[PDB]
Amino acid sequence: LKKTILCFGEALIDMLAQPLVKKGMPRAFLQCAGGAPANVAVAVARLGGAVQFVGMLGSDMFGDFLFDSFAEAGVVTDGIVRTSTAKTALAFVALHGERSFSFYRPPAADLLFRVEHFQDASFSDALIFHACSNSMTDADIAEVTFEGMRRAQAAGAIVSFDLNFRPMLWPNGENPASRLWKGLSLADVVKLSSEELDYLANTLAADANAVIQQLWQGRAQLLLVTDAAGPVHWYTRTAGGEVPTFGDAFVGGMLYTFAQQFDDAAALIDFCHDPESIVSTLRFAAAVGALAVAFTAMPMLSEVLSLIQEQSE
Amino acid sequence: LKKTILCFGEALIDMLAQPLPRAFLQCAGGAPANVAVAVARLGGAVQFVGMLGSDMFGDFLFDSFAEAGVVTDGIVRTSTAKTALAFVALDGERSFSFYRPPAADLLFRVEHFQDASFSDALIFHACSNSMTDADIAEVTFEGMRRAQAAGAIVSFDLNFRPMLWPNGENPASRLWKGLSLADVVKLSSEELDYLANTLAADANAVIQQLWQGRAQLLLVTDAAGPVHWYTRTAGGEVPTFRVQVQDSNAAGDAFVGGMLYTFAQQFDDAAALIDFCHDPESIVSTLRFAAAVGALAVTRQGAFTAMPMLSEVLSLIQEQSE
Ligand SMILES: Nc1ncnc2c1ncn2[C@@H]1O[C@H](COP(=O)(O)OP(=O)(O)OP(=O)(O)O)[C@@H](O)[C@H]1O
Ligand SMILES: [K+]
């Protein structure tokens, strides 16, 4: 319960296949820092927010790369633990028509983070605890995530859950629904894509409304549903609407702004009862989010400034 | 026709880290896989037997074998595990990071062997990397015993890579068992010492132990230094060729490739190996060719891609002869 954003989960290497300079030459793969909560933590640090990444990294070359990446971005690293038991996970993405994937996970270093690896100081100082479903791919890591979410709540931190459901990372022939819903019931703020909304609806053999109502049965106070290129839809236990604008980028902007606006977890409640604030804050989160990506700040800079001017006038 | 060379074991991807978003270059690899490609490049009948993942890397290895002329009928696939990856970088020593134990090649089982492979096989070649766990090790031993009974010469290149073995476990036992089952053994100077150490003795003790098994020929290597050969009746050393190293990767496998290739071309059957081991003139002639293949490989980058054709090997021998 303070001002720090605690991002928990997996950090891994994205290996991007490069187009063949073709013939005789071995094809190349480019190394890039990846992991859902991992990139959000980096985005927040870049925006200037106070953030810590909590998770396990392998003691290998890649683990070192990820650790350094966090340090350079300004992400606090003392919550990070290491292991030689498993290698840092790898996410290979290549191209006959589109994207092809190959994940070296499980096993993986990030899957081995255990409850004893959490430090009480991280929770006491966290204003927000953020997680994704990738740290729920096996029974052990899932429970670890759930306990982290409960500890966060108990400590007075706002619990944020960005589903980021990636089926390919889940065990063959198993149903993720159960863990996804448990995770959803422990979050104060939930972020979903329109596709995940329909997926959840199906798991219920009902509609989007049934999902939203199910959500309100747990801890959830705010639901954000992003789209293809459409507006962001927000929902609370008392209302709903859409955010006019001019995925992950958004999440970073959102956590950064929430940390800047809320003094505590109670502030979220007042926020949810104020559609005007909701709209203004999310529109801003979306805008400032682009900055986590010399450069042009236009037309956004002018758009944001003119709005504030009109509102003050 | 019983002239096929059967290379059994692992086929994996070597990911070569490039100097400074860091780039990694995809290269076909694996000890027995390298040998197979070397043999195929020379024009010999060869088949790679092992399991490849049902992933992008497995497809790359399958196609690379096919393009090189390696028969693929003995390859089996699995989606249970990914194709092994061997990351090679620096830190200024050549560092290593493997994505194995968990890997496709380790899941090959006795049931995957095909009688037709052993029926046409004149030679069965294997390495210690397919001995990194109890299950795969048993499969390798069985392949070796099956080959011998089917009338194929059993070739074993130790190719000991400690990093791939489980922590705390002593690989000595398995290594010695594989060694006792081979007709032809290839070791590095270092491996000879390692083996000498496991016996608390010297190189001679190791050699005498080998003669207690099936071994009829032992080759001990080292870089540009002459390779030494030993049979139960004599020993000698063959000078190498003088070349400019560009990439020593897969040098030893190329050497093995040239040697096995020559065995298959010259031997009518497995029994011919005995007469061969009793004829130093032939041994020196054959090892010269093998040394030539190894020399031409080290001057070319990669492994699968660094293998020479027969005309090129013979040219080097012709030129650097007189
Ligand atoms: N610098 C060199 N000059 C000439 N020939 C070489 C050189 N390096 C290797 N070779 C040839 O290749 C054979 C392969 O040998 P080396 O002793 O380096 O094998 P190794 O260390 O077992 O290989 P690997 O890296 O596959 O384990 C040599 O005996 C030799 O004939
Ligand atoms: K080479």
XYZ file of C-alpha atoms and ligand atoms in Angstrom:
667
model
C 0.000 0.000 0.000
C 2.085 2.977 -1.249
C 2.920 4.236 -4.775
C 4.841 1.427 -6.466
C 3.395 -0.714 -9.238
C 4.289 -4.348 -8.692
C 4.245 -6.333 -11.941
C 4.355 -10.083 -11.351
C 4.916 -12.982 -13.688
C 6.936 -14.004 -16.657
C 9.747 -12.265 -18.453
C 11.098 -14.177 -21.452
C 12.909 -13.799 -24.750
C 11.022 -13.147 -27.969
C 13.061 -14.540 -30.865
C 11.890 -12.904 -34.095
C 12.712 -14.773 -37.289
C 14.175 -12.473 -39.920
C 13.271 -12.704 -43.619
C 15.919 -14.590 -45.541
C 18.497 -12.360 -47.214
C 17.984 -15.685 -48.993
C 20.225 -18.510 -50.196
C 23.403 -19.895 -48.688
C 23.104 -17.647 -45.667
C 21.806 -19.045 -42.371
C 18.519 -17.394 -41.421
C 18.708 -15.029 -38.449
C 16.649 -14.551 -35.298
C 16.564 -11.291 -33.335
C 16.495 -11.281 -29.535
C 13.921 -9.059 -27.837
C 12.802 -8.667 -24.213
C 9.328 -10.155 -23.797
C 6.763 -11.397 -21.290
C 3.354 -9.791 -20.683
C 3.726 -8.222 -17.250
C 7.413 -7.814 -18.146
C 6.802 -5.376 -21.002
C 4.178 -3.483 -18.980
C 6.701 -2.965 -16.188
C 9.143 -1.589 -18.736
C 6.479 0.667 -20.264
C 5.626 2.131 -16.857
C 9.281 2.731 -15.972
C 9.750 4.521 -19.301
C 6.766 6.778 -18.584
C 8.402 7.624 -15.259
C 6.343 5.556 -12.857
C 7.661 3.752 -9.795
C 7.639 0.087 -10.730
C 9.078 -3.240 -9.675
C 9.102 -6.492 -11.626
C 8.706 -9.590 -9.500
C 9.452 -12.932 -11.059
C 12.090 -15.576 -11.645
C 14.792 -15.355 -14.311
C 17.182 -18.094 -15.342
C 20.867 -17.724 -14.511
C 21.597 -18.048 -18.243
C 22.651 -15.470 -20.872
C 19.045 -14.606 -21.593
C 18.220 -14.129 -17.912
C 21.076 -11.631 -17.728
C 19.729 -9.843 -20.808
C 16.273 -9.511 -19.253
C 17.694 -8.361 -15.907
C 19.769 -5.695 -17.660
C 16.795 -4.630 -19.763
C 14.795 -3.993 -16.588
C 17.661 -2.073 -14.964
C 18.185 0.147 -18.010
C 14.479 0.978 -18.257
C 14.432 2.050 -14.613
C 12.504 -0.965 -13.315
C 13.392 -1.911 -9.718
C 14.947 -5.391 -9.679
C 15.414 -6.431 -6.050
C 12.233 -8.481 -6.229
C 13.707 -10.659 -8.963
C 14.963 -14.171 -8.137
C 17.175 -16.508 -10.172
C 17.504 -20.236 -10.855
C 19.790 -22.652 -12.728
C 17.127 -25.371 -12.555
C 15.541 -24.175 -15.793
C 16.327 -21.968 -18.778
C 14.748 -18.610 -19.506
C 11.703 -19.252 -21.682
C 11.857 -18.572 -25.421
C 9.128 -17.311 -27.722
C 9.952 -18.019 -31.367
C 7.816 -16.303 -33.982
C 8.310 -16.851 -37.680
C 6.340 -16.711 -40.930
C 3.555 -19.746 -45.078
C 1.311 -16.732 -44.974
C 1.484 -15.556 -41.372
C 2.893 -15.947 -37.875
C 4.070 -19.363 -36.661
C 4.946 -19.908 -33.008
C 7.194 -22.156 -30.962
C 7.392 -21.770 -27.213
C 10.157 -23.302 -25.109
C 7.988 -23.277 -21.995
C 7.370 -25.427 -20.030
C 9.793 -25.993 -18.550
C 11.106 -22.478 -17.829
C 12.719 -20.394 -15.081
C 9.681 -18.103 -14.691
C 7.406 -21.094 -13.919
C 9.471 -21.853 -10.820
C 8.755 -18.714 -8.774
C 7.418 -19.879 -5.416
C 5.471 -18.167 -2.651
C 8.522 -17.868 -0.401
C 10.155 -15.779 -3.132
C 7.759 -12.903 -2.419
C 9.098 -10.245 -0.037
C 6.722 -8.479 2.348
C 8.364 -5.135 1.588
C 7.171 -5.380 -2.031
C 3.549 -5.738 -0.954
C 3.658 -3.069 1.755
C 4.941 -0.555 -0.784
C 2.679 -1.548 -3.674
C -0.213 0.678 -4.695
C -0.922 -1.797 -7.485
C -0.198 -5.504 -8.036
C -0.517 -6.397 -11.742
C -0.682 -9.875 -13.263
C -1.611 -11.787 -16.438
C -2.808 -15.355 -17.142
C 0.563 -16.540 -18.416
C 1.665 -17.145 -14.815
C -1.249 -19.575 -14.481
C -0.183 -22.124 -17.125
C 0.456 -24.905 -14.578
C -1.067 -25.683 -11.168
C 1.924 -24.563 -9.072
C 2.615 -21.205 -10.731
C -1.134 -20.506 -10.790
C -1.519 -20.912 -7.015
C 1.566 -18.749 -6.522
C -0.114 -16.038 -8.614
C -3.375 -16.355 -6.655
C -1.599 -15.994 -3.306
C 0.318 -12.999 -4.572
C -2.991 -11.447 -5.613
C -4.500 -12.173 -2.179
C -1.466 -10.812 -0.334
C -1.634 -7.687 -2.486
C -5.327 -7.183 -1.658
C -4.632 -7.821 2.046
C -1.838 -5.240 1.997
C -4.133 -2.603 0.529
C -2.866 -2.721 -3.041
C -5.190 -2.451 -6.016
C -5.122 -5.792 -7.835
C -5.008 -5.457 -11.625
C -5.501 -8.465 -13.883
C -4.927 -8.229 -17.643
C -6.127 -11.613 -18.921
C -3.744 -11.727 -21.887
C -4.985 -15.272 -22.560
C -2.562 -17.183 -24.823
C -4.017 -20.711 -25.382
C -0.842 -22.011 -27.031
C 0.984 -21.659 -23.704
C -1.510 -23.945 -21.972
C -1.230 -27.763 -21.556
C -2.738 -29.857 -24.331
C -6.225 -31.153 -23.568
C -6.745 -29.065 -20.434
C -9.431 -26.465 -19.734
C -8.019 -23.077 -18.552
C -11.488 -21.718 -17.724
C -11.296 -22.693 -14.043
C -8.060 -20.815 -13.314
C -9.034 -17.837 -15.457
C -12.249 -17.316 -13.452
C -10.485 -17.693 -10.112
C -7.936 -15.137 -11.248
C -10.769 -12.861 -12.393
C -12.542 -13.114 -9.024
C -9.439 -11.850 -7.182
C -8.927 -8.657 -9.200
C -10.190 -5.117 -8.472
C -9.480 -4.038 -12.049
C -9.885 -6.395 -15.005
C -8.773 -5.836 -18.582
C -10.006 -8.059 -21.418
C -9.983 -8.042 -25.216
C -13.347 -8.369 -26.994
C -12.278 -11.858 -28.050
C -11.547 -12.943 -24.479
C -14.932 -11.549 -23.474
C -16.649 -13.866 -25.977
C -14.439 -16.761 -24.905
C -15.469 -16.233 -21.274
C -19.086 -15.889 -22.384
C -18.854 -19.291 -24.074
C -17.374 -20.901 -20.961
C -20.636 -19.772 -19.351
C -22.829 -20.816 -22.280
C -24.250 -17.298 -22.105
C -23.548 -13.712 -23.185
C -21.176 -10.852 -22.422
C -23.548 -9.623 -19.741
C -23.313 -12.921 -17.885
C -19.527 -12.552 -17.792
C -19.697 -9.007 -16.463
C -22.184 -10.017 -13.762
C -20.033 -12.998 -12.810
C -17.134 -10.567 -12.440
C -19.103 -8.409 -10.001
C -19.518 -11.535 -7.833
C -15.857 -11.330 -6.843
C -13.508 -8.407 -6.197
C -13.882 -6.611 -9.558
C -14.944 -2.940 -9.525
C -13.766 -1.923 -13.006
C -13.718 -3.829 -16.296
C -11.991 -2.600 -19.441
C -12.664 -4.267 -22.782
C -10.363 -3.216 -25.639
C -11.055 -3.679 -29.340
C -9.790 -4.220 -32.882
C -9.494 -0.487 -33.441
C -12.768 0.522 -31.831
C -13.262 2.465 -28.579
C -12.405 1.053 -25.174
C -15.495 -0.021 -23.220
C -15.534 0.472 -19.471
C -17.889 -1.161 -16.982
C -18.470 -0.730 -13.243
C -21.014 -2.276 -10.883
C -23.257 0.770 -11.443
C -22.683 1.776 -15.077
C -20.886 1.467 -18.379
C -19.822 3.451 -21.404
C -17.049 3.790 -23.942
C -13.848 5.801 -23.985
C -13.474 8.063 -27.018
C -9.895 8.190 -28.290
C -7.799 10.091 -30.851
C -3.683 -3.165 -26.106
C -0.519 -3.484 -24.005
C 0.411 0.117 -24.719
C -2.861 1.068 -23.059
C -2.251 -1.073 -19.965
C 1.061 0.635 -19.327
C -0.504 4.062 -19.713
C -3.342 2.996 -17.422
C -1.209 1.641 -14.557
C 1.095 4.650 -14.795
C -1.831 7.069 -14.590
C -3.689 5.138 -11.862
C -0.575 5.188 -9.694
C -0.348 8.953 -10.300
C -4.027 9.552 -9.382
C -4.958 7.162 -6.592
C -3.521 7.704 -3.126
C -4.807 4.294 -2.040
C -7.040 1.361 -3.002
C -10.100 3.219 -1.713
C -9.600 5.895 -4.367
C -10.512 3.275 -6.980
C -14.043 3.087 -5.576
C -14.586 6.838 -5.818
C -13.156 6.625 -9.324
C -15.624 3.927 -10.401
C -18.572 6.058 -9.243
C -17.375 8.963 -11.415
C -17.909 8.349 -15.183
C -16.532 11.797 -16.033
C -13.279 11.003 -14.261
C -13.262 7.507 -15.765
C -13.541 8.885 -19.286
C -10.945 11.618 -18.764
C -8.423 9.296 -17.088
C -8.696 6.461 -19.633
C -8.542 8.816 -22.598
C -5.368 10.181 -21.021
C -3.974 6.728 -20.215
C -4.373 5.845 -23.890
C -2.621 9.029 -25.038
C 0.323 9.023 -22.650
C 0.703 5.298 -23.320
C 2.059 6.034 -26.781
C 5.050 7.662 -25.068
C 6.235 4.311 -23.702
C 6.810 3.193 -27.301
C 13.818 13.249 -31.145
C 10.194 12.446 -32.045
C 6.833 14.043 -32.859
C 4.395 14.390 -29.985
C 1.776 15.662 -32.434
C -1.087 15.598 -32.944
C -1.614 14.137 -29.436
C 0.233 16.928 -27.635
C -2.066 19.571 -29.142
C -5.138 17.371 -28.675
C -4.413 16.844 -24.964
C -3.488 20.484 -24.322
C -6.546 21.958 -26.070
C -8.877 19.722 -24.080
C -7.392 20.831 -20.750
C -7.584 24.462 -21.884
C -11.273 24.220 -22.817
C -12.078 22.432 -19.577
C -10.309 25.098 -17.505
C -11.991 27.898 -19.464
C 22.681 -53.957 -51.144
C 24.038 -53.700 -47.612
C 26.141 -50.542 -47.916
C 24.133 -47.989 -45.970
C 25.579 -45.980 -43.108
C 23.118 -45.502 -40.288
C 23.719 -42.455 -38.082
C 21.716 -42.549 -34.873
C 21.050 -39.935 -32.257
C 20.447 -36.245 -32.008
C 19.887 -33.645 -34.684
C 19.497 -30.163 -33.183
C 19.814 -26.487 -33.968
C 22.987 -24.584 -33.158
C 22.042 -20.924 -32.577
C 25.175 -18.865 -33.177
C 25.125 -15.533 -31.353
C 26.425 -12.728 -33.553
C 28.496 -9.730 -32.382
C 26.573 -6.577 -31.464
C 19.101 -6.192 -31.128
C 21.444 -9.181 -30.999
C 21.137 -11.660 -33.863
C 21.331 -15.439 -33.681
C 22.075 -17.564 -36.749
C 20.288 -20.880 -37.297
C 22.623 -23.792 -38.076
C 21.860 -27.494 -38.466
C 23.769 -29.556 -35.910
C 24.055 -32.699 -33.822
C 27.018 -35.091 -33.784
C 25.502 -38.045 -35.663
C 23.568 -35.650 -37.918
C 26.796 -33.935 -38.975
C 28.366 -37.296 -39.801
C 25.363 -38.255 -41.929
C 25.551 -35.045 -43.964
C 29.294 -35.410 -44.412
C 28.780 -38.937 -45.773
C 25.959 -37.795 -48.076
C 28.016 -34.900 -49.419
C 30.653 -37.469 -50.389
C 28.012 -39.455 -52.269
C 27.685 -42.341 -49.825
C 24.473 -44.179 -48.953
C 23.443 -42.852 -45.555
C 20.370 -42.652 -43.364
C 19.831 -40.538 -40.234
C 17.798 -42.304 -37.565
C 16.359 -40.235 -34.749
C 13.410 -38.168 -33.615
C 12.770 -34.583 -34.718
C 10.227 -32.254 -33.168
C 7.049 -31.350 -35.031
C 8.109 -27.717 -35.021
C 9.800 -25.146 -37.269
C 13.252 -26.365 -36.288
C 12.391 -30.012 -36.855
C 11.132 -29.137 -40.327
C 14.371 -27.259 -41.011
C 16.435 -30.288 -39.966
C 14.274 -32.671 -42.016
C 14.583 -30.524 -45.151
C 18.314 -30.027 -44.594
C 18.832 -33.808 -44.511
C 16.745 -34.271 -47.656
C 18.577 -31.524 -49.580
C 21.934 -33.050 -48.634
C 20.875 -36.482 -49.835
C 20.508 -38.152 -46.433
C 17.723 -40.749 -46.538
C 14.940 -39.646 -44.163
C 12.771 -42.806 -43.988
C 14.078 -43.545 -40.501
C 13.165 -40.198 -38.999
C 10.247 -40.069 -36.566
C 8.440 -36.996 -35.240
C 6.951 -35.845 -31.938
C 5.047 -32.811 -30.636
C 5.701 -33.894 -27.044
C 8.943 -31.922 -26.910
C 10.719 -29.258 -28.942
C 13.785 -29.730 -31.121
C 16.853 -29.210 -28.946
C 18.648 -25.873 -29.190
C 22.312 -25.195 -28.537
C 23.047 -21.492 -28.083
C 26.666 -20.559 -28.761
C 28.029 -17.169 -27.714
C 30.940 -15.587 -25.857
C 31.835 -14.638 -22.270
C 35.811 -14.243 -24.369
C 35.543 -18.038 -24.269
C 33.041 -19.856 -26.501
C 30.081 -20.228 -24.121
C 27.130 -22.659 -24.212
C 23.459 -22.834 -23.220
C 21.408 -25.900 -24.146
C 17.651 -26.396 -24.264
C 17.850 -30.138 -23.523
C 17.166 -32.537 -21.411
C 13.636 -31.753 -22.373
C 13.911 -32.346 -26.151
C 12.497 -34.333 -29.080
C 15.603 -36.418 -29.862
C 15.529 -37.891 -26.318
C 12.120 -39.461 -26.922
C 13.209 -41.960 -29.577
C 12.401 -45.474 -28.363
C 13.287 -48.991 -29.498
C 9.849 -49.286 -31.095
C 10.882 -46.503 -33.512
C 13.691 -48.556 -35.092
C 12.843 -50.044 -38.484
C 14.094 -53.506 -39.439
C 14.759 -52.308 -42.991
C 17.306 -49.750 -41.741
C 19.356 -52.463 -40.018
C 18.867 -54.849 -42.924
C 20.570 -52.538 -45.439
C 23.048 -51.167 -42.905
C 26.757 -51.872 -43.225
C 27.548 -49.411 -40.434
C 25.700 -48.087 -37.369
C 27.167 -44.900 -35.891
C 26.362 -43.350 -32.531
C 27.607 -40.901 -29.895
C 27.341 -40.444 -26.125
C 24.866 -37.562 -26.345
C 22.077 -40.095 -26.886
C 23.075 -41.586 -23.507
C 22.222 -38.543 -21.340
C 19.317 -40.296 -19.561
C 18.537 -43.924 -18.688
C 15.867 -44.402 -21.366
C 17.651 -42.957 -24.386
C 20.880 -44.658 -23.323
C 19.172 -48.060 -23.365
C 17.789 -47.291 -26.814
C 21.314 -46.522 -28.077
C 22.802 -49.711 -26.602
C 19.974 -51.711 -28.152
C 20.585 -50.108 -31.513
C 24.265 -51.007 -31.225
C 23.535 -54.636 -30.253
C 20.906 -54.900 -32.990
C 23.340 -53.535 -35.595
C 26.072 -55.990 -34.622
C 23.642 -58.908 -34.855
C 22.421 -57.604 -38.218
C 25.966 -57.634 -39.566
C 26.768 -53.934 -39.432
C 29.993 -52.450 -38.101
C 29.327 -50.449 -34.946
C 31.048 -47.078 -34.858
C 31.129 -45.019 -31.672
C 32.452 -41.463 -31.366
C 32.423 -40.646 -27.631
C 31.761 -36.951 -28.244
C 31.454 -36.421 -24.488
C 29.665 -33.169 -23.564
C 29.465 -33.099 -19.713
C 27.112 -30.100 -19.768
C 24.322 -32.245 -21.252
C 24.418 -34.796 -18.417
C 22.298 -34.570 -15.213
C 23.935 -32.823 -12.273
C 25.722 -35.074 -9.797
C 25.460 -38.172 -11.980
C 28.578 -40.056 -13.074
C 28.435 -40.835 -16.825
C 31.463 -43.162 -16.688
C 29.385 -46.340 -16.504
C 27.319 -45.599 -19.619
C 30.345 -44.394 -21.553
C 32.227 -47.617 -20.826
C 29.200 -49.711 -21.774
C 28.862 -47.940 -25.114
C 32.589 -48.349 -25.664
C 32.402 -52.103 -25.038
C 29.745 -52.461 -27.739
C 31.659 -50.763 -30.576
C 33.906 -52.152 -33.329
C 35.378 -48.731 -34.053
C 35.968 -46.102 -31.391
C 36.886 -42.462 -31.869
C 38.132 -40.388 -28.929
C 39.732 -36.991 -28.427
C 42.994 -36.580 -26.501
C 40.964 -35.089 -23.660
C 38.454 -37.939 -23.596
C 41.321 -40.429 -23.549
C 42.643 -38.714 -20.410
C 39.162 -38.472 -18.897
C 38.768 -42.209 -19.420
C 42.264 -42.801 -18.046
C 41.185 -40.876 -14.945
C 38.048 -42.985 -14.430
C 40.407 -45.955 -14.211
C 42.963 -44.213 -12.011
C 45.490 -45.337 -14.612
C 46.978 -44.284 -17.941
C 46.001 -44.214 -21.608
C 47.308 -47.763 -21.999
C 44.895 -49.000 -19.344
C 42.044 -47.425 -21.312
C 43.184 -49.075 -24.531
C 43.493 -52.508 -22.902
C 39.988 -52.113 -21.496
C 38.658 -51.397 -24.996
C 40.197 -54.630 -26.284
C 38.136 -56.460 -23.641
C 35.035 -55.539 -25.632
C 34.221 -55.477 -29.348
C 36.695 -52.701 -30.275
C 39.079 -53.528 -33.121
C 40.090 -49.954 -33.985
C 40.700 -46.847 -31.869
C 41.298 -43.341 -33.165
C 42.503 -40.623 -30.812
C 42.412 -37.057 -32.107
C 43.517 -33.525 -31.251
C 43.597 -30.330 -33.376
C 46.282 -30.068 -36.070
C 48.311 -32.722 -34.269
C 48.507 -36.157 -35.927
C 45.641 -38.505 -35.133
C 46.757 -41.727 -33.508
C 45.268 -45.094 -34.375
C 45.465 -48.395 -32.517
C 44.359 -51.937 -33.329
C 44.908 -55.074 -31.277
C 48.108 -55.760 -33.222
C 49.720 -52.363 -33.794
C 49.511 -48.600 -33.645
C 50.521 -45.546 -35.625
C 49.848 -41.922 -36.405
C 48.774 -40.129 -39.531
C 49.821 -36.553 -40.374
C 47.040 -34.107 -41.129
C 46.705 -31.539 -43.893
C 47.782 -27.921 -43.526
C 44.827 -25.559 -43.784
C 43.665 -22.180 -42.507
C 40.965 -22.623 -39.876
C 37.850 -20.496 -40.369
C 35.482 -22.506 -38.192
C 36.548 -25.734 -36.468
C 32.873 -26.550 -35.779
C 31.976 -30.195 -36.593
C 35.627 -30.935 -37.529
C 35.639 -34.293 -35.757
C 32.283 -35.350 -37.187
C 33.538 -34.570 -40.689
C 36.574 -36.755 -39.981
C 34.255 -39.559 -38.860
C 32.157 -38.946 -41.954
C 35.058 -39.373 -44.347
C 36.234 -42.506 -42.537
C 32.849 -44.272 -42.453
C 32.206 -43.241 -46.057
C 35.439 -44.957 -47.088
C 34.653 -48.081 -45.035
C 31.313 -48.471 -46.849
C 32.885 -47.960 -50.277
C 35.707 -50.442 -49.676
C 34.254 -53.162 -47.402
C 32.114 -55.952 -48.909
C 30.785 -56.695 -45.438
C 31.383 -56.157 -41.727
C 33.968 -58.941 -41.637
C 36.175 -56.881 -43.959
C 36.963 -54.565 -41.014
C 39.152 -57.274 -39.443
C 41.359 -57.612 -42.517
C 41.461 -53.818 -42.616
C 42.720 -53.592 -39.026
C 45.481 -56.073 -39.947
C 46.648 -53.863 -42.817
C 48.385 -50.592 -41.696
C 48.889 -49.559 -45.334
C 45.105 -49.492 -45.753
C 44.555 -47.872 -42.352
C 46.925 -44.998 -43.188
C 45.395 -44.573 -46.649
C 41.850 -44.433 -45.281
C 42.687 -42.165 -42.358
C 44.452 -39.814 -44.797
C 41.184 -39.394 -46.712
C 39.281 -38.881 -43.435
C 41.836 -36.279 -42.340
C 41.331 -34.538 -45.694
C 37.562 -34.327 -45.146
C 38.116 -32.916 -41.663
C 40.555 -30.314 -42.987
C 38.149 -29.063 -45.676
C 35.331 -28.783 -43.156
C 37.254 -26.621 -40.669
C 37.948 -24.122 -43.459
C 34.188 -23.682 -44.031
C 31.602 -22.133 -41.700
C 28.845 -24.066 -39.883
C 28.705 -27.864 -39.917
C 26.148 -29.225 -42.378
C 27.266 -26.407 -44.657
C 30.983 -27.010 -44.167
C 31.054 -30.488 -45.712
C 33.114 -31.067 -48.913
C 32.285 -33.142 -51.997
C 34.361 -36.161 -53.042
C 36.085 -34.280 -55.889
C 37.267 -31.583 -53.468
C 38.598 -34.052 -50.892
C 40.503 -36.035 -53.548
C 41.878 -32.773 -54.993
C 43.289 -31.734 -51.620
C 44.891 -35.168 -51.266
C 46.228 -35.062 -54.831
C 47.641 -31.554 -54.392
C 49.169 -31.880 -50.941
C 50.659 -35.275 -51.784
C 53.445 -34.146 -54.105
N 43.751 -26.900 -37.592
C 43.630 -28.032 -38.314
N 44.460 -28.286 -39.428
C 44.368 -29.446 -40.205
N 43.437 -30.416 -39.905
C 42.546 -30.268 -38.810
C 42.597 -29.045 -37.927
N 41.664 -29.175 -36.987
C 41.045 -30.368 -37.211
N 41.575 -31.037 -38.307
C 41.179 -32.396 -38.910
O 39.935 -32.848 -38.376
C 40.075 -34.037 -37.580
C 39.045 -33.677 -36.531
O 39.682 -33.278 -35.352
P 39.949 -32.429 -33.707
O 40.963 -33.189 -32.910
O 39.883 -30.926 -33.616
O 38.503 -33.105 -33.382
P 37.519 -32.915 -32.142
O 38.133 -31.925 -31.167
O 37.074 -34.267 -31.709
O 36.226 -32.320 -32.929
P 34.785 -31.847 -32.422
O 34.778 -30.316 -32.277
O 33.743 -32.294 -33.440
O 34.602 -32.483 -31.072
C 41.580 -33.956 -37.208
O 42.126 -35.188 -36.784
C 42.169 -33.429 -38.451
O 42.384 -34.489 -39.411
K 33.040 -26.090 -39.728
